[PDB]
């Protein structure tokens, strides 16, 4: 009744979203320099085979079966390659996702917001340079995550170029709270940002995250 309900409490609270996907990303083993290059070559060969087959599809000349099945097999090889690469590169995405925990947006979505940037990275990766796909994709993961966190983190919309000021305001206010000890003043904030002290007042009123109705007071 206590131990059984303890076991039931152990069994019921099972997935928890994060542990459900950590399992999934845990399965497909990560690549090394050769396999990344091979799968990139395979991807771009597949895309080249599709952009080739477009010609023979739209224009004409119904080619013999063997070469067609070969080209289809190269398309499928490209698909397999991009899918296997995307299934490989994920622990990077979660490792970068684990930086932006409790920053308006939920930790769970930021991984997928990372995965979009990852897929764009996979789209626009250049193997000829031979960069390491982590060190390459770091750009796209970050830019995608922070581009999402710019918009969807807040209830009210504020563009990235007008929220970066609020984030950096937060950071440097934390810095000035850390160093000087006390709270700094909008004037000194405007002296730090090099702006009109009537703007930092305007940006704080935006920085007021809205309050609920059904709250026990």
């Amino acid at each position: 009744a206590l131990r059984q309900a303890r076991k039931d409490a152990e069994l019921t609270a099972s997935a928890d979203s994060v542990r459900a996907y950590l399992k999934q990303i845990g399965k497909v083993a990560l690549l090394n320099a050769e396999e990344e290059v091979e799968l990139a070559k395979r991807i771009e060969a597949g895309l080249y085979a599709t952009q080739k087959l477009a010609e023979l599809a739209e224009k004409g000349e119904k080619l013999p079966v063997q070469q067609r099945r070969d080209m289809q097999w190269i398309c499928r090889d490209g698909d397999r390659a991009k899918n296997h690469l995307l299934e490989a590169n994920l622990r990077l995405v979660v490792s970068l996702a684990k930086r932006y925990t409790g920053r308006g947006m939920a930790f769970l979505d930021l991984i997928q917001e990372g995965n979009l940037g990852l897929i764009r990275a996979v789209e626009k990766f250049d193997y000829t340079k031979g960069y390491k796909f982590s060190t390459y994709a770091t750009w796209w993961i970050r830019q995608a995550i922070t581009r999402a966190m710019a918009d969807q983190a807040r209830t009210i919309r504020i563009p990235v170029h007008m929220v970066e000021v609020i984030n950096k305001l937060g950071r440097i206010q934390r810095e000035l709270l850390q160093d000087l000890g006390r709270e700094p003043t909008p004037e000194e904030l405007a002296k730090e940002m090099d702006i009109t002290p009537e703007k930092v007042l305007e940006i704080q009123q935006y920085a007021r995250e809205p309050i609920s109705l059904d709250q026990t007071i």
Binding site: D16, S17, N115, T155, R157, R208, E209, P210
Partner: protein
């Protein structure tokens, strides 16, 4: 629009949700940060939801009322009124459809019970932890299974060959190694053998995997779970025409599409037929949820959501709070999460992302929508600021503070005020007093109307200014506007029907509501800072009903009994008691001198006596001989003196007091004479008699004159309290010190330790209680009758002998915080003043009392809520159901040949079932007799010791009850009305005295809840002769039967519980009805042993006895209305064989109709009131009481239609209450002016 009938519930199918919606939500944005207008196709957006402000487009093109129905081509919003923002719902198109949580996390899971899964397995399927195979083609997989088994066998042969080859190679390698090296070698042999063993393990695991793949491929069917998904990965590409499978809710949509319901039904029928036991038990819960979809029109397709509806913008509003801050609703966050996740998933489908990412996005989306519909339903809830969970949609329909319990039941109103109440003793019972400013504010339109209808205000605006300035010209008008215009006075908490009363507002100066002194008994309102609300009925109907129903003058008698509540109390009692009390040895007393002098004290008129009393010559209380004319004489005196004619003008001599004459002068011209002191019981009896005999207006005036005279004489009463007026009795100390002498010996034996603590405590408590009673007797004896304390007490005005006992002599014994009595009593009177010890001991009981009474109000409120919610349906629907069935009331105490004391609560104010036949058949009373005191007396004088009365317990009505079977009403004083809501009257009346209920409230609570007793005393299943087996520690009771067979045995019988007092002894005979032990019989036991009617008697007897104990009296029929609402359903063991689950509570009439079979098997059940309001026929009320989601889910899938026959539901929806003045025979009445009146004009 204005009209309504039966409401029905269902499941919102994606097409129906799309058919609701006006546009699609496809942006996570709320509002623009600069301009604060909502963005296009986001939350709050003006395109789909209509415009924000009244007559405005988004950009700003049309703001005229001229243009109605036109849709601007610039933005695309429709120019209409802003109200539609509360009436317009949105929708969200999901790329992948997700399931609804309600039919999943509910116990049992319904989705799983439709497609026969375990809820954990279903969970795993819907939350993307498993693939499910939707449809397998047995014929197509069977046909070419041979070839696939051949290529399988080849696929095995290959890996067998490779295994053999590698084993051979490693063996050859080993032998070559040994041959090359030839202890150190034997180790390398061991290593080689180990590696061969590893090859063997790899090979056997591969073969096992292949064999298991073929096994799981061969054994394939719909509704099957895959654990690892390597099986499905290998099964995915090969066999691409035989089976299909998806993860999530789309799979469940395809599954519910690939489903014929009648097959599952007819399979279920043979499963419940053949598979009787656990499988029939599991089939039993499936029966209802499956069989619903056949009898109902709605499909099970609507359990999975392709589109999700969006609650209107204003129910989840974003308005800026004072100081620049923004106040939003949590819904916005959840909807934003859902739409964001959706809009990401769409892009994941657009790009062509991998299936794991997409399915994880779908899982997270599922979790988000699940959370949005119900947060904290699955696992950890979503938290925004400071780790507090956000209120989901189902959170806005559940809990104590969501809806129903607070939001739909009670709310603040217009044309309404609240002030401090004060006694206004000048006023007539129908009149009240209003603070003239408060009044001026309360009738602010009604005054303006008259001020512009007259030439006092030139224009309506100017009138609205003049009423604001409160100018001298409005006050002469406010009388003209308030002239016979009723107002509804209400005090929270409203404990009974007379807790609200309508009055005529008189305009008074000051800041106080001048209440009438007679309605304080009803309102339960002491003038010690209590406040009452006033309401202004606006509609002609409301104004009329205020004047007709709830006018104080009409509501004199209690709904509870029919005793007058609007009667002299506290002051008026002492006033009239002094006025009428005849005391000897007074001034101007009638002596009747013997031969020497005249009689001296005779009076020609009451006027002469008033003239004599105005002089300091005659006292108002003396035996005097008036000659009376205007007052109707006593029955005997009329019978003697006049006989033929009455006495309006006829004169007669009395022997009374001027006060009694002055009192009788108040009572009606034709009413006979009293000549008796007005004790509150006698006042109650007279006013009750007057209420029974005369019209209500007459009584309502006579009681007003009684009030006027009462208070006028309450002054000249001479009732004051003083240190000299309160007297300590002389025997107090003599008794106290005589009990101290023995108490000393008790405490001495206790100190010695010869007597136990409990024995000494008991002895001392007994002694000092005896002493307390003695001091009480001394207080009773010593005090003169003219003493003010005796007047305030022994007139019945207030208090009791106990209070004057505590004030004169000794406070007595006083209890610990536990309840056990402290052996040391309070020997000092409150006149004498207490010692620190005595007072400090007194504090306990006072505080405990204050606490328990401070809880009692809330507990009794809670009880009254249940007792109202249970009897929501019991309204008088028709005149007569035409039955001969009735309950049998004794009406007489075994002769005499000895009248019954509780006739007044039992068989008084009741319609009869039969003709009152006697021994011969000299039939005295016929059917349809009110049973008034004359009739009740006549039935006693006839010589019958029983009568069969027609009650609600035996009423054959389709809906509620029929008028004639209820009996006459207590409120009206006539036959109960064909509209009356006798159920909620009964509920209020039974619910009210719980505050005054000081063995107690637990017993009535547990009785009405029908729960197992605190002391389970057994009743006799069979009659027979009792035998005593005096066992060790406990008892054992055996009844030897009359018919012949086995004797009834119970194991452990509690000795401390005590056997029933004819007394229980070894070798007596006891009846079937008789309870064996002294305490409480288990209602279920009594039902199953005897039957419904004896329990119907027992419950009413038991509920009455505890009221009779506390002194309050309610009329049995009010209990019988609730006991009826208890005993009116059946429990089914196993029967029906068509949409009837075994172990299901079923309503009588609906059960009987299908049971009889013109073209089942039920036993009587006794249900608890909560278990009755839980198992009610209605759904939106059942939802309003408790467990909203549970019942509403069932209601939705069942498609269960409520008739709105119950009042409680018809309160929640703002519709005309069907009870009282809301039946079709009332609400539709064509009143034409009569043909003779028309032409006359």
């Amino acid at each position: 629009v204005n009209f309504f009938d039966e409401l029905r519930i269902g499941l919102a199918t994606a097409d129906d949700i799309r058919n609701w919606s006006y546009g699609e939500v496809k942006k996570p944005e709320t509002i623009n940060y600069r301009t604060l207008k909502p963005e296009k196709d986001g939350l709050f957006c003006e395109k789909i939801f209509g415009p924000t402000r009244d007559w405005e487009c988004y950009c700003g093109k049309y703001k005229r009322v001229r243009f109605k129905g036109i849709i601007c081509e610039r933005c695309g919003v429709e120019v209409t009124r802003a109200k539609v923002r509360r009436e317009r719902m949105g929708h969200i198109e999901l790329a992948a459809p997700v399931t609804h949580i309600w039919y999943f996390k509910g116990v049992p899971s319904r989705l799983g019970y439709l497609l026969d899964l375990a809820p954990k397995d279903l969970e795993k399927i819907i939350y993307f932890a498993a693939y499910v195979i939707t449809s397998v083609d047995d014929e197509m997989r069977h046909n070419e299974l041979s070839t696939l088994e051949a290529e399988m066998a080849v696929e095995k042969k290959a890996v067998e060959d490779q295994r053999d080859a590698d084993l051979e190679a490693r063996a050859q390698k080993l032998e070559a190694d040994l041959a090359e090296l030839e202890d150190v070698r034997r180790k390398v042999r061991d290593s080689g053998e180990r590696e061969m063993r590893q090859l063997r393990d790899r090979a056997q695991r591969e073969l096992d995997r292949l064999d298991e793949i073929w096994n799981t491929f061969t054994k394939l069917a719909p509704k099957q779970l895959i654990v690892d998904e390597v099986l499905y990965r290998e099964l995915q590409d090969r066999y691409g025409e035989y089976f299909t499978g998806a993860m999530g809710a789309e799979s469940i949509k395809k599954l519910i599409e690939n489903f014929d319901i009648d097959a599952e039904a007819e399979s279920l029928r043979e499963v419940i037929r053949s598979g009787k036991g656990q499988k029939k038990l599991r089939a039993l819960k499936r029966l209802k949820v499956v069989a619903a979809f056949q009898q109902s029109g709605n499909s099970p397709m609507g359990m999975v959501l392709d589109a999700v509806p969006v609650i209107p913008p204003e129910l989840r509003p974003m308005v800026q709070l004072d100081g620049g801050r923004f106040a939003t609703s949590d819904l916005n966050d959840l909807y934003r999460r859902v739409i964001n996740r959706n809009n990401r998933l769409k892009r994941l489908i657009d790009l062509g992302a991998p299936e794991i990412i997409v399915n994880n996005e779908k899982r997270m989306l599922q979790e988000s929508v699940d959370a949005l519909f119900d947060n904290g339903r699955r696992g950890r809830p979503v938290t925004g600021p400071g780790n507090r969970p956000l209120k989901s949609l189902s959170d806005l329909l559940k809990g104590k503070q969501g809806r129903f319990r607070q939001n739909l039941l009670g709310k603040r109103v217009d044309y309404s005020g609240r002030s401090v109440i004060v006694v206004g003793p000048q006023l007539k019972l129908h009149q009240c007093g209003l603070p003239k400013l408060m009044a001026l504010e309360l009738f602010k339109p009604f005054v303006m109307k008259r001020l512009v209808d007259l030439n006092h205000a030139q224009n309506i605006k100017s009138a609205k200014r003049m009423v604001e300035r409160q100018r001298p010209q409005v006050w002469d008008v406010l009388e003209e506007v308030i002239a016979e215009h009723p107002v509804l006075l209400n005090r929270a908490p409203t404990l009974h029907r007379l807790g609200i009363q309508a009055f005529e507002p008189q305009l008074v100066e000051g800041k106080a509501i001048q209440l009438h002194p007679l309605v304080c008994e009803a309102f339960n309102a002491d003038f010690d800072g209590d406040q009452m609300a006033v309401h202004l009925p606006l509609s002609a109907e409301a104004q009329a009903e205020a004047r007709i129903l709830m006018l104080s003058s009409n509501n004199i008698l209690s709904p509870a009994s029919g005793k007058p509540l609007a009667m002299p109390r506290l002051d008026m009692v002492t006033g009239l008691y002094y006025l009428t009390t005849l005391v000897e040895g007074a001034t101007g007393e009638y002596q009747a001198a013997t031969k020497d002098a005249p009689e001296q004290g005779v009076y020609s008129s009451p006027a002469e006596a008033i003239m004599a009393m105005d002089r300091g010559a005659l006292s108002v209380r003396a035996k005097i001989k008036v000659r009376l004319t205007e007052l109707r004489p006593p029955t005997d005196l009329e019978a003697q003196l006049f006989e033929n004619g009455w006495k309006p003008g006829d004169a007669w001599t009395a022997e009374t007091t001027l006060g009694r004459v002055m009192f009788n002068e108040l009572l009606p011209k034709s009413y006979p004479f009293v000549n008796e002191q007005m004790h509150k019981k006698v006042q109650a009896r007279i006013i009750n008699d007057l209420a029974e005999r005369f019209p209500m207006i007459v009584v309502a005036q006579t009681v007003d004159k009684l009030k006027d005279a009462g208070f006028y004489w309450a002054t000249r009463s001479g009732v004051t309290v003083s240190m000299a007026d309160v007297l300590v009795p002389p025997q107090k100390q003599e008794i106290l010190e005589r009990h101290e002498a023995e108490a000393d010996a008790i405490e001495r034996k206790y100190q010695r330790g010869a007597l136990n603590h409990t024995e000494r405590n008991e002895s001392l408590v007994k002694i000092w209680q005896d002493a307390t009673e003695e001091v009480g007797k001394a207080l009773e004896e010593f005090y003169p009758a003219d003493n003010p304390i005796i007047t305030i007490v022994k007139s019945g005005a207030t208090g009791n002998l106990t209070q004057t006992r505590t004030l004169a002599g000794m406070k007595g014994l006083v209890t610990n915080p536990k309840g056990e009595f402290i052996p040391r009593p309070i020997k000092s009177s409150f006149r004498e003043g207490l010692t620190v010890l005595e007072y400090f001991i007194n504090t306990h009981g006072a505080r405990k009392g204050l606490a328990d009474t401070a809880l009692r109000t809330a507990d009794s409120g809670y009880l009254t809520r249940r007792l109202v919610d249970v009897s929501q349906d019991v309204i008088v629907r028709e005149h007569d159901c035409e039955t001969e069935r009735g309950i049998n009331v004794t009406l007489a105490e075994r002769g005499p040949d000895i009248r019954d004391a509780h006739v007044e609560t039992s068989a008084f104010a009741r319609t009869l079932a039969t003709d009152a036949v006697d021994a011969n058949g000299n039939v005295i009373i016929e059917r349809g007799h009110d049973l008034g005191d004359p009739a009740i007396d006549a039935l006693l004088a006839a010589g019958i010791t029983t009568v069969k009365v027609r009650s609600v317990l035996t009423c054959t009505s389709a809906t509620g009850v029929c008028a004639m079977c209820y009996g006459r009403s207590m409120a009206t004083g006539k036959l109960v009305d064909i509209g009356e809501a006798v159920g909620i009257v009964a509920a209020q009346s039974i619910g009210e005295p719980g505050t005054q209920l000081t063995g107690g409230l637990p017993r009535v609570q547990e009785l009405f809840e029908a729960r197992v007793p605190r002391n389970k005393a057994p009743i006799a299943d069979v009659a027979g002769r009792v035998r005593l087996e005096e066992s060790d520690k406990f008892f054992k009771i055996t009844i030897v039967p009359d018919d012949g067979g086995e004797e009834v045995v119970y194991d452990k019988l509690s000795k401390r519980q005590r056997l029933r007092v004819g007394v229980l002894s070894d070798g007596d005979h006891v009846e079937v009805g008789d309870q064996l032990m002294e305490g409480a019989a288990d209602p279920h036991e009594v039902l199953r042993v005897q039957g419904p009617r004896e329990v119907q008697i027992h419950l009413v007897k038991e509920v009455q006895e505890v009221y009779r104990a506390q002194g309050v009296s309610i009329h049995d029929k009010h209990i019988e209305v609730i006991v009826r609402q208890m005993l009116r359903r059946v429990t089914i063991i196993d029967s029906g064989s068509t949409e009837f689950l075994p172990g299901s509570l079923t309503e009588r009439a609906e059960f009987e109709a299908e049971n009889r079979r013109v073209v089942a098997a039920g036993r009587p059940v006794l249900m608890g009131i909560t278990k009755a309001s839980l198992a009610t026929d209605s759904w939106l009320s059942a939802a309003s009481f408790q467990e909203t989601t549970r019942v509403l889910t069932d209601a939705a899938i069942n498609c269960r239609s409520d008739k709105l026959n119950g009042l409680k539901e018809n309160v929640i929806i703002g519709k005309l209450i069907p009870a009282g003045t809301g039946i079709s025979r009332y609400r539709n009445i064509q009143v034409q002016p009569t043909e003779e009146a028309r032409a006359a004009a």
